[PDB]
Write an enzyme that holds these catalytic residues in place. Structure first.
Site, mmCIF file in Angstrom:
data_model
loop_
_atom_site.group_PDB
_atom_site.id
_atom_site.type_symbol
_atom_site.label_atom_id
_atom_site.label_comp_id
_atom_site.label_asym_id
_atom_site.label_seq_id
_atom_site.Cartn_x
_atom_site.Cartn_y
_atom_site.Cartn_z
ATOM 1 N N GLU A 31 0.853 -1.180 0.000
ATOM 2 C CA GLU A 31 0.000 0.000 0.000
ATOM 3 C C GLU A 31 0.890 1.231 0.000
ATOM 4 N N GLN A 32 0.630 2.153 -0.928
ATOM 5 C CA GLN A 32 1.508 3.304 -1.099
ATOM 6 C C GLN A 32 1.265 4.359 -0.026
ATOM 7 N N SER A 33 0.036 4.861 0.068
ATOM 8 C CA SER A 33 -0.297 5.906 1.035
ATOM 9 C C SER A 33 -1.733 5.769 1.540
ATOM 10 N N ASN A 34 -8.898 -0.236 11.331
ATOM 11 C CA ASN A 34 -8.740 -0.769 9.982
ATOM 12 C C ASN A 34 -7.261 -0.891 9.636
ATOM 13 N N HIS A 379 -44.912 -2.517 12.537
ATOM 14 C CA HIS A 379 -45.707 -1.316 12.413
ATOM 15 C C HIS A 379 -45.395 -0.414 13.599
HETATM 16 C C1 LIG Z 1 -0.021 0.352 -5.804
HETATM 17 N N1 LIG Z 1 0.617 0.472 -6.972
HETATM 18 N N2 LIG Z 1 0.577 -0.341 -4.811
HETATM 19 C C2 LIG Z 1 -0.056 -0.465 -3.642
HETATM 20 N N3 LIG Z 1 -1.247 0.014 -3.279
HETATM 21 C C3 LIG Z 1 -1.819 0.690 -4.282
HETATM 22 C C4 LIG Z 1 -1.290 0.906 -5.543
HETATM 23 N N4 LIG Z 1 -2.159 1.661 -6.318
HETATM 24 C C5 LIG Z 1 -3.175 1.880 -5.519
HETATM 25 N N5 LIG Z 1 -3.037 1.324 -4.274
HETATM 26 C C6 LIG Z 1 -3.981 1.391 -3.165
HETATM 27 O O1 LIG Z 1 -5.061 0.535 -3.434
HETATM 28 C C7 LIG Z 1 -6.181 0.961 -2.628
HETATM 29 C C8 LIG Z 1 -7.464 0.785 -3.399
HETATM 30 O O2 LIG Z 1 -8.563 0.902 -2.471
HETATM 31 P P1 LIG Z 1 -10.049 0.793 -2.954
HETATM 32 O O3 LIG Z 1 -10.961 0.767 -1.784
HETATM 33 O O4 LIG Z 1 -10.335 1.874 -3.998
HETATM 34 O O5 LIG Z 1 -10.065 -0.612 -3.687
HETATM 35 P P2 LIG Z 1 -11.359 -1.344 -4.231
HETATM 36 O O6 LIG Z 1 -11.335 -2.778 -3.691
HETATM 37 O O7 LIG Z 1 -11.434 -1.208 -5.699
HETATM 38 O O8 LIG Z 1 -12.552 -0.552 -3.576
HETATM 39 C C9 LIG Z 1 -13.581 0.051 -4.387
HETATM 40 C C10 LIG Z 1 -14.512 0.846 -3.497
HETATM 41 O O9 LIG Z 1 -13.805 1.388 -2.380
HETATM 42 C C11 LIG Z 1 -15.214 1.975 -4.251
HETATM 43 O O10 LIG Z 1 -15.992 1.413 -5.302
HETATM 44 C C12 LIG Z 1 -16.118 2.842 -3.375
HETATM 45 O O11 LIG Z 1 -15.324 3.827 -2.713
HETATM 46 C C13 LIG Z 1 -17.174 3.508 -4.252
HETATM 47 N N6 LIG Z 1 -18.017 4.461 -3.518
HETATM 48 C C14 LIG Z 1 -17.702 5.835 -3.501
HETATM 49 C C15 LIG Z 1 -16.590 6.342 -4.163
HETATM 50 C C16 LIG Z 1 -16.302 7.702 -4.124
HETATM 51 C C17 LIG Z 1 -15.091 8.224 -4.850
HETATM 52 C C18 LIG Z 1 -17.145 8.570 -3.408
HETATM 53 C C19 LIG Z 1 -16.863 10.048 -3.345
HETATM 54 C C20 LIG Z 1 -18.257 8.057 -2.748
HETATM 55 C C21 LIG Z 1 -18.547 6.695 -2.785
HETATM 56 N N7 LIG Z 1 -19.667 6.233 -2.110
HETATM 57 C C22 LIG Z 1 -19.924 4.955 -2.154
HETATM 58 C C23 LIG Z 1 -21.095 4.472 -1.450
HETATM 59 O O12 LIG Z 1 -21.882 5.159 -0.802
HETATM 60 N N8 LIG Z 1 -21.285 3.109 -1.554
HETATM 61 C C24 LIG Z 1 -20.478 2.223 -2.247
HETATM 62 O O13 LIG Z 1 -20.778 1.024 -2.248
HETATM 63 N N9 LIG Z 1 -19.377 2.688 -2.909
HETATM 64 C C25 LIG Z 1 -19.124 3.986 -2.857
HETATM 65 C C26 LIG Z 1 -5.880 2.393 -2.172
HETATM 66 O O14 LIG Z 1 -5.677 2.454 -0.764
HETATM 67 C C27 LIG Z 1 -4.606 2.762 -2.945
HETATM 68 O O15 LIG Z 1 -3.736 3.588 -2.180
HETATM 69 C C1 LIG Z 2 -50.090 2.913 23.805
HETATM 70 C C2 LIG Z 2 -50.178 1.873 22.720
HETATM 71 C C3 LIG Z 2 -49.172 1.795 21.760
HETATM 72 C C4 LIG Z 2 -49.223 0.842 20.743
HETATM 73 N N1 LIG Z 2 -48.197 0.800 19.809
HETATM 74 C C5 LIG Z 2 -48.265 -0.101 18.862
HETATM 75 C C6 LIG Z 2 -47.195 -0.148 17.881
HETATM 76 O O1 LIG Z 2 -46.210 0.587 17.843
HETATM 77 N N2 LIG Z 2 -47.359 -1.126 16.924
HETATM 78 C C7 LIG Z 2 -48.414 -2.019 16.841
HETATM 79 O O2 LIG Z 2 -48.418 -2.843 15.919
HETATM 80 N N3 LIG Z 2 -49.415 -1.970 17.770
HETATM 81 C C8 LIG Z 2 -49.334 -1.055 18.723
HETATM 82 N N4 LIG Z 2 -50.341 -0.994 19.654
HETATM 83 C C9 LIG Z 2 -51.442 -1.954 19.556
HETATM 84 C C10 LIG Z 2 -52.552 -1.506 18.615
HETATM 85 O O3 LIG Z 2 -53.067 -0.233 19.006
HETATM 86 C C11 LIG Z 2 -53.682 -2.530 18.668
HETATM 87 O O4 LIG Z 2 -53.124 -3.834 18.768
HETATM 88 C C12 LIG Z 2 -54.617 -2.480 17.465
HETATM 89 O O5 LIG Z 2 -54.985 -1.121 17.226
HETATM 90 C C13 LIG Z 2 -55.842 -3.338 17.682
HETATM 91 O O6 LIG Z 2 -56.866 -2.934 16.753
HETATM 92 P P1 LIG Z 2 -58.251 -3.668 16.708
HETATM 93 O O7 LIG Z 2 -58.509 -4.091 15.257
HETATM 94 O O8 LIG Z 2 -58.277 -4.747 17.742
HETATM 95 O O9 LIG Z 2 -59.306 -2.526 17.082
HETATM 96 P P2 LIG Z 2 -59.022 -1.051 17.596
HETATM 97 O O10 LIG Z 2 -58.032 -0.384 16.716
HETATM 98 O O11 LIG Z 2 -58.687 -1.114 19.092
HETATM 99 O O12 LIG Z 2 -60.416 -0.355 17.401
HETATM 100 C C14 LIG Z 2 -61.581 -0.784 18.137
HETATM 101 C C15 LIG Z 2 -62.648 0.260 17.926
HETATM 102 O O13 LIG Z 2 -63.941 -0.272 18.289
HETATM 103 C C16 LIG Z 2 -64.673 0.731 18.953
HETATM 104 N N5 LIG Z 2 -65.686 0.079 19.779
HETATM 105 C C17 LIG Z 2 -65.483 -0.724 20.870
HETATM 106 N N6 LIG Z 2 -66.586 -1.195 21.402
HETATM 107 C C18 LIG Z 2 -67.587 -0.670 20.598
HETATM 108 C C19 LIG Z 2 -68.991 -0.791 20.626
HETATM 109 N N7 LIG Z 2 -69.660 -1.510 21.533
HETATM 110 N N8 LIG Z 2 -69.695 -0.136 19.677
HETATM 111 C C20 LIG Z 2 -69.035 0.586 18.767
HETATM 112 N N9 LIG Z 2 -67.719 0.772 18.640
HETATM 113 C C21 LIG Z 2 -67.046 0.112 19.591
HETATM 114 C C22 LIG Z 2 -63.634 1.549 19.713
HETATM 115 O O14 LIG Z 2 -64.114 2.865 19.953
HETATM 116 C C23 LIG Z 2 -62.460 1.555 18.721
HETATM 117 O O15 LIG Z 2 -62.480 2.671 17.840
HETATM 118 C C24 LIG Z 2 -50.308 -0.045 20.695
HETATM 119 C C25 LIG Z 2 -51.316 0.030 21.649
HETATM 120 C C26 LIG Z 2 -51.262 0.981 22.662
HETATM 121 C C27 LIG Z 2 -52.369 1.040 23.682
#
Ligand SMILES: *[C@@]1([N])=N[C]=NC2=C1N=[C]N2[C]1O[C]([C]OP([O])(=O)OP([O])(=O)O[C][C]([O])[C]([O])[C]([O])[C]N2C3=[C]C([C])=C([C])[C]=C3N=C3C(=O)[N]C(=O)N=C32)[C]([O])[C]1[O]
Ligand SMILES: Cc1cc2nc3c(=O)[nH]c(=O)nc-3n(C[C@H](O)[C@H](O)[C@H](O)COP(=O)(O)OP(=O)(O)OC[C@H]3O[C@@H](n4cnc5c(N)ncnc54)[C@H](O)[C@@H]3O)c2cc1C
Lengths: 397, 444
Positions: A31-33, A34, A379
């Protein structure tokens, strides 16, 4: 003389070296110039030199004075050198000041009052979002005809709206002609206008980092300067592998991690993992909210003649958005009607970078969209929106 | 005469009413309170509760969070009402329903007088639950004592909130009010908090709650409540606690105040309406959905009850309480504790050859972006077939991530798939690469 040599500190080489060390092998990371998790391992020697091939079997270690300090060998060598920012040949670049690539911007001293981005790619739109949120006035210039053209276009329309509502100025069909700097400021000369900025971001793509004397080897390069690799990430020399951005294709950190799986499979396992069985590859464009994508867009599905159905759900129709206090976004899915399989999804909204992995798994494992429609979700969440996002009947195209 | 009568504006009821109306049936929905349009979740449950948890996490004041809670509740209540009432095939009747017989329902005004009566060949009981009021000396005379629903409408922020009870709802209010600055003491009668949960993960919630200044107590028998004019004392076996407000959160019981003696609808040991696997009561044309039929009290269980009843009355009858799939849940403390499948204690007691593996959230690089190192992820795997038996995710995004593991369990996806999958980056989901890695090959 080592067991395994990785060249570069990328994700694939780093994790491959750590695995080989737990096996008991002595690994060398160059390598010229983890950073400590590699050096502190007894079986891993991190060498702070510049790698350059002397042959197909030995690698020279160059110090900062470009002098040969040592040479090293091993029966398997991994090339993992990443990529670098593409510098555009424009007028006044070498003389202009306050110009940055993606790396230089991330280490900028000040917050720009006006940041101009030449380039409208995923990375460019990300930075425009990150800096608008920090209070910067942002203009971004796209050379092409539209923004994010490989993405679903009425989803990107929502993204452009949310970006404009944050004060970001988007421009299309913009050729940038010249850069000039009045010292404290820099002006970008374009076809439509001349913008004055405190910082200029050059975000027009990354090209493979292939500087290690490949002429002394039989390693071949492809059309775009990338190292040619087969399905097992073998270069044209069979005991040398290339991982990460230095070969062609998708440039993601997780693609680099999967590259390690392929190479480990080829070197230590049953060799069943290839670049042909990665599964569907998801990605996220980290705007605000994030745009996450996997599989086809409906435009692609129609072009490949699928009998498809598409469905969408605005985030404002998702009750969890009221808890999030954010109504922006659009979720969109494309379904195959023949089977009931998911062809692709575009999730633009909060938690999309996490939710997209659910759909990735469904596509790979052939879980029909009806299962995601009827499933019990926690969700309140964004995931439970799948009860509505996938609640539709076939529309036979 | 209607085609369908739904008693209660609950989750299963409003969803089943909306479907039947799209079919062309004429539906009557009886709801006793206009403050309850949408059910318990919309008005006095999940929606107002997590609006306040979310806003308290953001640093919002007590007054600002409660005002936004009112707007959110009022908006969704109005939305839910018109989603039903504006349908030409649904009549929302503002009355208290009471059975006159097996086949017709009286409509009672708030003076318990019969205004009219309606009938239909199918009746759905969806009346939810009510808070369990404990038998405690001085309750009917003590002041500043609140329901879960009374607390959600409290007109002041308490200096000291004392909670009688230590269930999931109790711990959610404790975390919510601690984040708003209130001092909170919670008292549990049992030996331990959140039994039936992985007690290794529970010890994390406990410490994270205590590090916020929450006082927790177990083996506490509350014997008496007394109040002056601006303070209330909770008399227990360990101590007397002086409070600004007292929350009674010791469970919720089925609401069966429907004059069931005029019917053949039976009740079970725990006051629930007895139902079979198709949610039929002991009267075959009458179904019961949601909390009132006992078991798990969740909004999504109620939504699934609509799937079973719709399957029975309109579909192929294949959906029962025996094929819901694995049921996830989330305790919305900070960060949320999410759960699906077996705990490792359960897997051990049933004599599985199981593997459990944990991953600290501080070992997930996304936590640095989240600015929160707190959390523990945990999985339990059946070693004989690589199937996922259960998981506990305590950390940011756990309420979203748990749904991935639920899907895998239901579809018999072995853990190795989640271990080796490509995930978006940087995310909490990509932690699965490490969480599901048991390192069997980590040797010479
Ligand atoms: C000689 N003669 N002797 C010794 N060592 C030598 C030498 N010539 C060169 N070198 C050294 O060799 C390495 C080469 O390193 P590298 O990592 O370039 O090799 P490789 O395996 O081809 O890697 C390709 C990969 O890194 C590259 O495709 C990604 O960087 C591409 N890429 C990317 C590139 C640029 C320029 C920008 C600005 C941004 C991104 N972003 C992404 C990205 O988000 N995802 C992605 O997958 N790829 C990106 C070296 O150290 C020489 O000194
Ligand atoms: C604080 C909290 C956070 C949660 N976070 C998440 C989460 O991030 N992800 C997730 O997947 N789940 C989450 N849940 C769970 C989710 O809210 C429930 O599992 C889901 O909404 C259940 O829906 P359901 O189909 O059973 O009926 P519900 O969505 O509970 O609806 C029932 C409805 O029936 C009505 N109803 C009831 N009895 C009667 C009646 N006799 N006559 C008429 N209407 C009536 C009520 O008013 C209500 O509107 C959370 C729950 C709580 C409490």
């Amino acid at each position: 003389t080592y067991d395994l040599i990785v060249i570069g500190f990328g994700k694939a080489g780093k994790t491959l070296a750590k695995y080989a060390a737990s096996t008991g092998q002595h690994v060398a990371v160059i390598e010229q110039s983890n950073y400590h998790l590699l050096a502190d391992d007894n079986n891993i020697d991190v060498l702070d030199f510049k790698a350059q091939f002397k042959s197909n079997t030995e690698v020279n270690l160059l110090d900062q004075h470009d002098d040969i300090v040592d040479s090293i060998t091993a029966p398997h060598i991994i090339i993992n050198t990443g990529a670098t920012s593409v510098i555009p040949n424009i007028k006044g670049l070498d003389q202009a000041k306050h110009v940055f690539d993606s790396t230089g911007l991330l280490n900028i001293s000040y917050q720009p009052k006006h940041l101009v981005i030449v380039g409208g790619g995923y990375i460019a739109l990300e930075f425009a979002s990150m800096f608008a949120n920090l209070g910067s006035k942002v203009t971004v210039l796209e050379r092409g005809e539209s923004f994010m053209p490989r993405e679903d276009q009425d989803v990107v329309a929502y993204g452009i709206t949310d970006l404009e509502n944050k004060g970001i100025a988007l421009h299309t069909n913009v050729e940038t002609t010249e850069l000039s700097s009045d010292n404290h400021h820099t002006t970008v000369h374009t076809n439509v206008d001349n913008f004055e900025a405190d910082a200029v971001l050059l975000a027009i793509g990354r090209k493979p980092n292939t500087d290690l004397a490949l002429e002394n080897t039989d390693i071949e390069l492809g059309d775009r300067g990338e190292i040619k690799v087969n399905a097992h990430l073998q270069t044209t020399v069979p005991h040398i592998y290339a991982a990460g951005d230095v070969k062609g294709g998708l440039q993601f950190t997780y693609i680099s991690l999967d590259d390690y799986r392929i190479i480990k499979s080829a070197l230590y396992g049953n060799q069943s993992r290839t670049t042909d069985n990665r599964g569907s590859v998801p990605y996220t464009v980290f705007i605000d909210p994030p745009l996450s994508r996997v599989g086809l867009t409906s435009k692609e599905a129609a072009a490949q003649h699928y009998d498809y159905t598409e469905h969408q759900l605005l985030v404002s129709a998702i009750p969890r958005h009221k808890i999030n206090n954010d109504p922006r976004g659009l979720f969109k899915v494309v379904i195959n009607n023949e089977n009931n399989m998911i062809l692709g999804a575009t999730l633009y909204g909060k938690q999309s970078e996490e939710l997209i992995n659910i759909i990735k798994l469904a596509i790979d494992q052939n879980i029909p969209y009806t299962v995601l429609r009827d499933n019990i979700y926690t969700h309140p969440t964004m995931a439970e929106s799948f009860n509505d996002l996938f609640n539709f009947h076939h529309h036979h195209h």
